[PDB]
Amino acid sequence: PRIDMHSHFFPRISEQEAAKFDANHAPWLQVSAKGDTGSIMMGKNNFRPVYQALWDPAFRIEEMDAQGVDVQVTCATPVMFGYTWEANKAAQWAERMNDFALEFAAHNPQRIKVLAQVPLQDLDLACKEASRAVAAGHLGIQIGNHLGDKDLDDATLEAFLTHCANEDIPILVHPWDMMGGQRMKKWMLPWLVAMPAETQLAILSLILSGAFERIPKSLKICFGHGGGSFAFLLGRVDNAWRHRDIVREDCPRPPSEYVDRFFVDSAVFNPGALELLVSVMGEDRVMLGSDYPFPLGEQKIGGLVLSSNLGESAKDKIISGNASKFFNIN
Amino acid sequence: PRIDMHSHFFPRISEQEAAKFDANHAPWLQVSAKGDTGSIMMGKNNFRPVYQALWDPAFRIEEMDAQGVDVQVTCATPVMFGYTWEANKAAQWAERMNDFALEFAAHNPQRIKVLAQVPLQDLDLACKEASRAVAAGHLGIQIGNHLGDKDLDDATLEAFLTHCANEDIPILVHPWDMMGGQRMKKWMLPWLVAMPAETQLAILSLILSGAFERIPKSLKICFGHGGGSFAFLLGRVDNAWRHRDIVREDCPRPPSEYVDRFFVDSAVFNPGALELLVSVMGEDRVMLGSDYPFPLGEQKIGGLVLSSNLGESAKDKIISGNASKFFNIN
Ligand SMILES: [Zn+2]
Ligand SMILES: [Zn+2]
């Protein structure tokens, strides 16, 4: 079997639906005149354009059939997160979005699994929604990797992860709200430079802060896009830890020894990069994920893993066995 | 023989010397009471602490002897760059610093080679200083990777590279003035996350802008710290180029085919990372560099390359043959 655990959806939100939350900043879906194409919209401005797989579960199942994908795990498009909104409205939005998600999966719940969003700007509302959404059928949570200047080392975010650990709630960490300022204006550089750095920063924030010494081993947490540049730059981190006490202040063993505390997806778009990723993380900690249905995703889902020279046993773990245990999928 | 082409020096600048340029922002060297240790100072504030190899060429030669380093190429500590200063004062500073550099190397010019800094905020003064410093004995230029929000795709920086290409002046691009804002305050995260992303951004800015279609092939340009995360994230860039026209707008062939237009040093602190780097760049485009004498450099210079499983022929190119041709060292 084949599980793709990194994909996105966007719900059929109407303009008036979104305006009952925020006419200016709540996103909504316009399935335009040709109907094949949408804008995610913000207010009446256009946000970015999308196509039908994002919103149509029937159309998506036929593509999954064609790709040979048996089970796809899907979650919010990050524009849905609403982390800057007033907390109570953000909690109402998260519940609505997560209900939308379960309705998406209800067309074929054996083949479409969903993860939930949470109002991460209020720790109490976010823990309550994580528990509520998983009890209603979600298999885990997808969060952005940072909340403004608060990275994953911040006690509020560590506490959210620890809540999920203690309740057996898996987490997918997705880069969002990219660093860079007024640079990287062209050629989608935020997706090529800032996004892998954001994910590396999230992983290193947990490691170098000592958070894994405090978060229970029960935490199942995965980072998108192969963990960004984390695995390649890990030697540089270990060398810094060895030679500067301020890099060691909160992290009692070499940073690379914490790779047994998290997972990555396999979306690194290159055979050598995947071999290095599996070398660093272990065949038990890399899961097939495509970023379907976005253009910077993998067109032939699983093609990189399937055409690799990894062991047949490792190929099965990455394509199916790891996600099956991580998300409890049969 | 062994050439280390990535290292730094800082000159014996006195507080009054620096104040004749800028009492607040010109850096200077305080060889403190125990004399083993300095602060680079800024005004009367402390900038950061350094040790004697940075400023003492005699002491440095004995360490090079112990390490088995025959020739070391050395250049300004980036705090010396002065890219935010008024241009004419910055040009006076660059000339003074580059004279300081040649005095450093004059104790043993066969074993200590220097690269120059330039007042990059004025293209004309920067080209004139590049030519002047190379004519006086410098083997090339070291620049920061960006000038504020101007990355290497900016016409002014492309024109500086093209000047150097046309005059057979090699360039080392070093990350500096790191992105990140108010994040990455702890555990030297700017050096672990922001620095490799800065260097990747510089390389991708040249590639995706089409600059290599305009800059002559004669350009010899090397990027520090293995090119940052560039080689690992290259598959993701090629995939984006294939699937979004705005990533292709200015770059007429797959981004990965431009690796024959630049070099990287070998400082990636991990055997698998070095194997991937050589796979991507080619054994002819990776040069031994240590980041001596800084703590996030390589303590045993050349140890990673020498203990690798690369061919004996590839080991010689990386340790000596490539830098010898790149910088014209005998
Ligand atoms: Zn995604
Ligand atoms: Zn350096």
XYZ file of C-alpha atoms and ligand atoms in Angstrom:
662
model
C 0.000 0.000 0.000
C 0.978 3.678 -0.372
C 0.352 6.538 2.051
C 1.032 10.167 1.152
C 1.091 12.090 4.446
C 1.843 15.616 3.169
C -0.948 17.265 1.183
C -3.343 20.184 1.446
C -7.010 21.038 0.958
C -8.979 24.271 0.913
C -12.722 24.287 1.671
C -15.630 25.670 -0.331
C -15.825 28.829 1.800
C -18.025 31.542 0.337
C -17.177 35.228 0.453
C -20.038 35.894 2.880
C -19.067 32.892 5.002
C -15.559 34.307 5.373
C -16.835 37.833 6.055
C -18.796 36.617 9.083
C -15.288 36.188 10.558
C -13.225 38.868 8.821
C -14.124 40.563 5.554
C -10.502 41.658 5.110
C -8.383 38.688 6.193
C -10.469 35.508 6.250
C -9.669 33.529 3.069
C -12.381 32.112 0.804
C -12.677 30.065 -2.395
C -13.885 31.377 -5.760
C -14.415 28.518 -8.225
C -14.178 30.835 -11.264
C -15.977 31.039 -14.615
C -14.202 28.079 -16.212
C -14.666 26.208 -12.893
C -11.377 24.341 -13.285
C -9.545 27.130 -11.495
C -9.963 29.123 -8.337
C -8.491 31.965 -6.489
C -8.148 31.611 -2.858
C -9.344 35.146 -2.173
C -8.786 37.515 0.726
C -11.616 40.000 1.016
C -12.172 40.942 -2.609
C -8.464 40.912 -3.496
C -7.014 37.807 -5.101
C -4.638 35.877 -2.874
C -3.204 33.153 -5.131
C -4.662 30.808 -7.770
C -5.442 27.131 -7.171
C -6.915 24.198 -9.071
C -9.696 21.703 -8.471
C -7.804 18.960 -6.626
C -7.391 21.349 -3.678
C -11.138 21.594 -3.046
C -12.820 18.626 -4.772
C -12.545 15.270 -2.966
C -14.195 13.336 -5.809
C -11.736 14.686 -8.379
C -8.918 14.058 -5.895
C -9.783 10.367 -5.431
C -9.521 9.801 -9.181
C -6.069 11.401 -9.216
C -5.082 9.285 -6.194
C -6.249 6.198 -8.097
C -4.165 7.240 -11.117
C -1.090 7.968 -8.978
C -1.452 4.699 -7.074
C -1.979 6.510 -3.750
C -4.118 4.387 -1.420
C -4.383 6.733 1.595
C -3.685 10.467 1.576
C -3.422 12.537 4.764
C -4.448 16.116 4.090
C -4.592 19.318 6.124
C -5.181 23.077 5.926
C -3.483 25.317 3.431
C -1.378 27.569 5.730
C -3.258 30.723 4.622
C -6.109 29.244 6.709
C -4.166 29.334 9.995
C -5.273 32.768 11.251
C -2.543 33.017 13.899
C -2.696 36.848 13.929
C -6.451 37.037 14.600
C -8.108 37.715 17.935
C -7.949 34.403 19.747
C -11.638 33.619 20.234
C -12.524 34.334 16.606
C -9.481 32.261 15.597
C -10.786 29.377 17.713
C -14.202 29.605 16.065
C -12.489 29.620 12.668
C -10.322 26.585 13.520
C -13.383 24.576 14.580
C -15.197 25.520 11.380
C -12.153 24.666 9.238
C -11.678 21.334 11.019
C -15.332 20.445 10.505
C -14.861 21.365 6.828
C -11.896 18.961 6.829
C -13.899 16.022 8.181
C -16.581 16.686 5.562
C -13.864 16.534 2.903
C -12.702 13.140 4.193
C -16.239 11.782 4.684
C -16.573 11.050 0.941
C -14.023 8.276 1.503
C -12.724 8.198 5.103
C -10.755 4.993 4.532
C -8.684 6.755 1.843
C -8.711 10.414 2.960
C -7.405 11.232 6.449
C -7.287 14.775 7.843
C -5.173 16.738 10.322
C -6.491 19.739 12.221
C -5.512 23.362 12.689
C -5.491 25.093 16.076
C -5.659 28.690 17.357
C -2.024 28.604 18.441
C -2.079 32.224 19.682
C -3.962 31.015 22.798
C -2.455 27.917 24.370
C -5.663 26.919 26.147
C -7.907 27.252 23.079
C -5.309 25.426 20.967
C -5.040 22.429 23.310
C -8.825 22.236 23.565
C -9.248 22.282 19.781
C -6.484 19.709 19.256
C -8.267 17.302 21.622
C -11.692 18.116 20.158
C -10.645 17.628 16.523
C -8.828 14.337 17.149
C -11.807 13.004 19.114
C -14.033 13.880 16.132
C -11.829 11.940 13.690
C -8.695 13.935 12.889
C -5.492 11.889 13.016
C -3.294 14.719 14.270
C -2.522 18.425 14.077
C -0.738 20.568 11.510
C 0.831 23.742 12.923
C 2.968 26.459 11.429
C 6.578 26.320 12.574
C 6.581 29.657 14.421
C 4.202 32.239 15.872
C 5.817 35.533 14.914
C 9.052 35.930 16.845
C 8.151 32.904 19.005
C 9.885 29.791 17.703
C 9.316 26.229 18.904
C 11.649 26.742 21.892
C 9.123 29.204 23.349
C 7.424 27.704 26.406
C 3.962 28.258 24.946
C 4.748 26.222 21.836
C 6.672 23.590 23.790
C 3.637 23.280 26.073
C 1.369 22.746 23.066
C 3.628 19.943 21.802
C 3.701 18.442 25.317
C -0.113 18.482 25.487
C -0.207 16.579 22.194
C 2.468 14.143 23.393
C 0.510 13.351 26.536
C -2.708 12.768 24.539
C -1.115 10.652 21.758
C -1.856 13.372 19.184
C 0.634 13.397 16.258
C 1.848 16.721 14.854
C 2.998 17.839 11.417
C 5.065 21.047 11.517
C 4.805 23.081 8.335
C 6.868 26.177 7.482
C 4.827 29.332 7.181
C 5.076 33.131 7.399
C 8.598 33.068 6.051
C 11.547 35.131 7.246
C 13.304 37.399 4.783
C 11.815 40.880 4.972
C 11.908 42.820 1.706
C 14.306 40.380 0.013
C 13.428 37.281 -2.019
C 10.833 39.172 -4.078
C 11.370 37.103 -7.253
C 11.501 33.526 -8.616
C 9.596 32.111 -5.596
C 12.769 32.483 -3.499
C 10.708 32.384 -0.220
C 9.775 28.794 -1.098
C 13.339 27.834 -2.105
C 15.426 29.590 0.571
C 13.211 30.800 3.399
C 10.962 27.723 3.707
C 13.759 25.151 4.232
C 15.463 27.538 6.672
C 12.225 28.020 8.628
C 11.887 24.264 9.065
C 15.550 23.866 10.023
C 15.077 26.688 12.555
C 12.060 24.913 14.085
C 13.983 21.634 14.493
C 17.063 23.360 15.888
C 14.933 25.467 18.226
C 13.626 22.251 19.826
C 17.070 20.623 19.951
C 19.281 23.488 21.088
C 16.740 24.652 23.678
C 16.745 21.240 25.383
C 13.023 20.873 24.671
C 13.429 17.159 23.906
C 14.797 16.696 27.434
C 11.402 17.974 28.680
C 8.885 16.808 26.046
C 7.886 13.133 26.571
C 9.290 10.548 24.145
C 5.673 9.784 23.273
C 5.571 12.879 21.059
C 5.091 11.959 17.400
C 6.175 15.027 15.449
C 7.108 15.304 11.775
C 8.655 18.200 9.851
C 7.726 18.964 6.264
C 9.938 19.037 3.166
C 12.492 16.612 4.508
C 13.111 18.809 7.520
C 14.279 21.614 5.249
C 18.073 21.860 5.211
C 18.374 20.277 8.679
C 20.013 16.974 7.759
C 22.628 18.530 5.458
C 23.632 21.274 7.919
C 23.666 18.966 10.961
C 27.442 18.485 10.924
C 27.874 22.249 11.144
C 25.555 22.345 14.175
C 27.418 19.514 15.953
C 30.719 21.280 15.287
C 29.373 24.526 16.757
C 28.014 22.697 19.805
C 31.467 21.157 20.376
C 33.248 24.504 20.204
C 31.021 27.173 21.791
C 29.591 26.853 25.284
C 26.641 29.109 24.473
C 25.528 26.546 21.865
C 25.621 23.849 24.614
C 24.028 25.914 27.385
C 20.616 24.173 27.183
C 21.381 21.052 25.090
C 23.216 18.321 27.049
C 24.258 15.938 24.264
C 25.374 16.395 20.632
C 22.505 17.827 18.583
C 22.596 14.970 16.065
C 21.676 12.416 18.743
C 18.129 13.842 18.914
C 17.115 12.604 15.443
C 15.391 9.671 17.157
C 12.843 12.148 18.575
C 11.213 13.303 15.321
C 10.271 12.402 11.755
C 10.561 14.052 8.344
C 8.703 13.603 5.122
C 10.637 12.475 2.040
C 10.007 15.531 -0.173
C 13.581 16.480 -1.125
C 13.306 16.096 -4.921
C 16.712 14.463 -5.447
C 18.127 10.926 -5.062
C 21.347 11.906 -3.282
C 19.472 14.205 -0.906
C 17.096 11.350 -0.033
C 19.977 8.956 0.616
C 21.592 11.509 2.955
C 18.228 12.166 4.648
C 17.717 8.440 5.322
C 21.329 8.127 6.471
C 20.803 10.920 9.021
C 17.237 10.167 10.134
C 17.025 6.398 9.720
C 14.683 4.431 7.491
C 12.128 4.436 10.347
C 11.791 8.229 10.505
C 11.156 9.293 6.874
C 7.600 9.214 5.484
C 6.402 9.650 1.910
C 4.853 13.082 1.467
C 4.166 14.896 -1.802
C 2.830 18.426 -1.067
C -0.072 17.563 -3.373
C -1.640 19.372 -5.132
C 0.791 22.304 -5.255
C 3.202 22.863 -8.187
C 6.302 22.694 -5.989
C 5.156 19.226 -4.916
C 6.054 15.880 -6.430
C 4.225 15.280 -9.712
C 4.764 11.495 -9.688
C 3.934 10.748 -6.054
C 6.433 8.297 -4.587
C 8.565 8.224 -7.741
C 11.725 9.403 -5.971
C 11.417 6.798 -3.220
C 10.326 4.007 -5.565
C 13.179 4.617 -8.031
C 15.799 4.912 -5.285
C 18.463 2.334 -4.476
C 17.254 2.023 -0.868
C 16.467 -1.440 0.443
C 13.085 -2.920 -0.414
C 12.400 -2.971 3.337
C 13.306 0.723 3.648
C 11.156 1.571 0.620
C 8.103 -0.050 2.259
C 8.668 1.791 5.547
C 8.900 5.159 3.782
C 5.985 4.524 1.424
C 3.614 2.950 3.970
C 4.903 1.381 7.193
C 6.088 4.546 8.945
C 2.989 6.668 8.305
C 0.788 3.689 9.184
C 2.349 3.555 12.666
C 2.794 7.345 13.020
C -0.850 8.222 12.241
C -2.436 4.838 13.149
C -3.651 4.063 9.618
C -4.693 0.527 8.652
C 50.936 20.407 -0.594
C 47.930 21.835 1.291
C 46.116 25.118 0.689
C 43.464 26.455 3.060
C 41.571 29.150 1.134
C 39.001 30.198 3.767
C 40.409 32.031 6.785
C 40.286 35.452 8.401
C 42.572 38.075 9.919
C 41.989 41.268 11.869
C 44.630 44.025 11.933
C 46.298 45.765 14.861
C 44.026 48.816 14.571
C 44.216 51.166 17.534
C 41.209 52.913 19.028
C 42.463 56.296 17.801
C 43.250 54.868 14.366
C 39.658 53.665 14.058
C 38.233 56.939 15.392
C 39.901 58.893 12.583
C 37.277 57.099 10.448
C 34.355 56.580 12.825
C 34.563 56.625 16.609
C 31.244 54.767 16.826
C 31.352 52.131 14.082
C 34.926 51.564 12.914
C 36.192 48.341 14.553
C 39.550 48.135 16.337
C 41.681 45.561 18.167
C 42.382 45.525 21.910
C 45.066 42.958 22.767
C 43.986 42.764 26.435
C 45.833 42.440 29.751
C 46.697 38.755 29.378
C 47.609 39.497 25.725
C 46.418 36.083 24.551
C 42.933 37.455 23.995
C 41.377 40.432 22.310
C 38.117 42.094 21.796
C 37.400 43.388 18.444
C 35.909 46.618 19.764
C 33.434 49.077 18.295
C 33.907 52.525 19.764
C 34.407 51.724 23.432
C 31.825 48.919 23.478
C 33.025 45.351 23.105
C 32.062 43.726 19.825
C 33.154 40.088 20.196
C 36.238 38.342 21.622
C 39.051 36.897 19.506
C 42.381 35.155 20.020
C 45.936 35.704 18.843
C 45.924 33.714 15.596
C 43.534 36.300 14.121
C 46.056 39.139 14.404
C 49.532 37.593 14.792
C 51.125 36.244 11.591
C 54.128 34.772 13.425
C 51.917 32.799 15.810
C 49.744 31.803 12.845
C 52.655 30.340 10.853
C 53.530 28.046 13.756
C 49.938 26.797 13.895
C 49.980 26.324 10.105
C 53.180 24.293 10.492
C 51.530 22.158 13.187
C 48.365 21.656 11.115
C 50.360 20.812 7.992
C 48.971 23.827 6.098
C 51.482 25.015 3.492
C 49.613 28.039 2.069
C 46.714 29.847 3.730
C 44.595 32.450 1.926
C 43.206 34.951 4.403
C 40.887 37.950 4.207
C 38.966 40.508 6.277
C 36.742 39.595 9.165
C 33.300 40.710 7.864
C 32.901 43.292 10.672
C 35.579 45.208 8.715
C 33.449 45.586 5.568
C 31.848 48.970 6.333
C 29.151 48.640 3.660
C 26.816 51.072 5.486
C 29.373 53.900 5.710
C 29.547 56.955 3.481
C 31.198 55.710 0.318
C 34.361 57.820 0.224
C 35.253 57.091 3.849
C 34.493 53.415 3.154
C 36.907 53.507 0.210
C 39.623 55.040 2.380
C 38.977 52.340 4.981
C 39.133 49.525 2.395
C 42.499 50.765 1.107
C 43.857 50.971 4.648
C 42.533 47.493 5.506
C 43.967 46.020 2.301
C 47.360 47.567 3.010
C 47.117 46.074 6.517
C 46.436 42.727 4.812
C 49.549 42.868 2.630
C 51.624 43.735 5.703
C 50.195 40.644 7.401
C 51.248 38.461 4.458
C 54.662 40.129 4.059
C 56.086 38.117 6.989
C 55.845 35.078 4.704
C 54.243 35.916 1.329
C 54.925 32.447 -0.078
C 52.764 30.913 2.679
C 50.240 33.679 3.465
C 48.083 35.002 0.611
C 45.472 37.736 1.078
C 42.173 38.755 -0.517
C 40.883 42.318 -0.471
C 37.754 44.110 0.666
C 35.994 46.757 -1.423
C 33.584 49.653 -0.780
C 30.719 47.798 -2.439
C 28.217 50.617 -1.772
C 29.805 52.567 -4.668
C 30.358 50.478 -7.778
C 33.054 52.766 -9.173
C 35.097 52.938 -5.955
C 34.722 49.170 -5.500
C 35.989 48.299 -8.990
C 38.890 50.717 -8.586
C 39.892 49.214 -5.233
C 39.568 45.643 -6.529
C 41.987 46.448 -9.370
C 44.303 48.429 -7.078
C 44.519 45.735 -4.385
C 45.143 42.882 -6.833
C 47.845 44.910 -8.592
C 49.513 45.440 -5.193
C 49.566 41.698 -4.435
C 46.105 40.526 -3.390
C 44.994 37.305 -5.078
C 41.311 38.213 -5.224
C 38.407 39.874 -3.441
C 36.194 38.812 -0.554
C 32.731 40.406 -0.553
C 29.685 39.978 1.619
C 26.861 38.137 -0.113
C 24.382 41.035 -0.112
C 24.237 44.806 0.320
C 21.112 45.315 2.405
C 18.079 44.411 0.325
C 20.273 44.181 -2.801
C 21.209 40.571 -3.492
C 23.679 39.348 -6.110
C 21.045 39.593 -8.874
C 21.085 43.388 -8.477
C 22.733 45.018 -11.495
C 25.241 46.867 -9.323
C 26.540 43.652 -7.769
C 26.412 41.761 -11.063
C 28.444 44.595 -12.598
C 31.047 44.287 -9.841
C 31.387 40.547 -10.516
C 31.626 41.264 -14.264
C 34.416 43.803 -13.670
C 36.322 41.142 -11.729
C 35.651 38.532 -14.424
C 37.025 40.796 -17.130
C 40.177 41.546 -15.084
C 40.862 37.924 -14.004
C 40.167 38.820 -10.358
C 38.845 35.854 -8.304
C 36.084 36.424 -5.745
C 35.163 34.733 -2.478
C 31.554 35.405 -1.428
C 31.052 35.288 2.322
C 27.699 35.442 4.138
C 27.268 38.511 6.284
C 24.617 40.757 7.858
C 22.283 37.831 8.320
C 18.539 37.768 7.717
C 16.246 36.849 10.581
C 15.103 39.997 12.356
C 14.414 39.559 16.067
C 14.499 35.746 15.907
C 17.515 33.462 16.343
C 18.636 35.282 19.503
C 20.154 32.176 21.143
C 22.596 29.277 20.587
C 24.349 31.072 17.680
C 21.347 30.272 15.456
C 22.328 33.087 12.982
C 25.481 31.090 12.204
C 23.623 27.756 11.938
C 20.438 28.762 10.081
C 20.786 32.254 8.647
C 24.370 31.971 7.343
C 23.822 28.878 5.139
C 20.566 30.399 3.857
C 22.306 33.687 3.018
C 24.871 31.836 0.919
C 22.210 29.715 -0.785
C 20.284 32.930 -1.528
C 23.380 34.508 -3.117
C 23.958 31.490 -5.391
C 20.294 31.235 -6.349
C 20.099 34.981 -6.953
C 22.823 34.629 -9.610
C 21.266 31.506 -11.143
C 17.573 32.372 -11.174
C 18.238 35.930 -12.365
C 20.089 34.672 -15.454
C 23.236 36.484 -14.314
C 25.447 33.612 -15.501
C 24.053 34.138 -19.010
C 25.538 37.671 -18.831
C 28.658 37.316 -16.647
C 31.650 35.977 -18.658
C 32.708 32.362 -18.070
C 36.061 33.790 -17.001
C 34.582 34.676 -13.607
C 36.218 32.684 -10.811
C 33.821 32.922 -7.880
C 33.642 30.747 -4.769
C 31.005 30.598 -2.030
C 31.888 29.947 1.589
C 30.776 27.106 3.867
C 30.161 24.647 1.078
C 27.729 27.016 -0.581
C 25.497 26.890 2.484
C 22.515 24.601 1.917
C 22.644 25.100 -1.873
C 23.700 21.617 -2.964
C 21.191 19.796 -0.741
C 18.226 21.989 -1.739
C 19.097 22.017 -5.457
C 16.591 19.301 -6.368
C 13.826 21.409 -4.847
C 14.924 24.389 -6.967
C 15.002 22.333 -10.193
C 11.537 20.979 -9.405
C 10.194 24.503 -8.868
C 11.799 25.713 -12.100
C 10.096 22.850 -13.976
C 6.663 23.659 -12.572
C 6.325 27.451 -12.244
C 6.936 29.832 -15.126
C 7.852 32.693 -12.798
C 10.812 30.610 -11.568
C 11.942 30.225 -15.230
C 11.292 33.810 -16.326
C 14.987 34.836 -16.336
C 16.802 31.462 -16.168
C 16.803 29.570 -19.497
C 18.071 26.137 -18.437
C 17.633 23.974 -15.311
C 19.249 25.695 -12.326
C 21.480 22.709 -11.540
C 23.290 23.023 -14.882
C 24.996 26.230 -13.680
C 27.199 24.475 -11.096
C 30.032 24.614 -13.639
C 30.087 28.414 -13.196
C 31.183 28.605 -9.542
C 33.135 26.963 -6.731
C 32.511 26.154 -3.070
C 34.794 25.533 -0.165
C 34.651 22.150 1.579
C 33.591 23.350 5.054
C 30.498 21.192 5.647
C 31.665 19.328 8.777
C 30.263 15.917 7.808
C 31.389 13.055 5.527
C 28.023 12.442 3.855
C 27.508 16.161 3.263
C 30.938 16.363 1.604
C 30.190 13.384 -0.637
C 26.915 15.014 -1.736
C 28.687 18.363 -2.243
C 31.318 16.752 -4.499
C 28.603 14.807 -6.317
C 26.733 18.046 -7.078
C 29.666 20.394 -7.719
C 32.306 18.050 -9.116
C 35.730 17.292 -7.695
C 37.095 20.283 -9.663
C 34.897 22.871 -7.930
C 35.379 22.192 -4.185
C 38.348 23.751 -2.357
C 39.640 23.078 1.147
C 38.692 25.934 3.453
C 38.666 25.915 7.255
C 37.273 29.254 8.556
C 40.426 29.485 10.674
C 40.776 30.743 13.343
C 37.114 30.910 14.384
C 35.512 28.316 16.714
C 32.889 27.283 14.159
C 35.754 26.424 11.803
C 37.503 23.104 11.342
C 39.872 22.345 14.220
C 41.879 19.720 12.297
C 42.288 21.526 8.977
C 41.707 19.147 6.078
C 40.759 16.242 8.349
C 37.312 15.783 6.793
C 38.684 15.711 3.249
C 41.722 13.601 4.141
C 39.669 10.977 6.010
C 37.005 10.791 3.296
C 36.507 7.916 0.871
C 36.926 10.216 -2.148
C 39.475 9.244 -4.773
C 43.106 10.097 -4.102
C 42.941 12.288 -7.218
C 39.850 14.096 -5.899
C 41.487 14.539 -2.488
C 44.491 16.284 -4.090
C 42.272 18.604 -6.146
C 40.285 19.655 -3.070
C 43.312 20.008 -0.796
C 45.605 21.778 -3.284
C 45.034 21.540 -7.042
C 41.800 23.535 -7.265
C 42.882 26.492 -5.120
C 46.259 26.510 -6.876
C 44.520 27.090 -10.226
C 41.704 29.270 -8.810
C 44.013 31.754 -7.036
C 47.184 31.149 -9.125
C 49.253 29.774 -6.232
C 52.469 27.837 -6.888
Zn 2.821 21.664 2.315
Zn 34.575 32.831 7.194
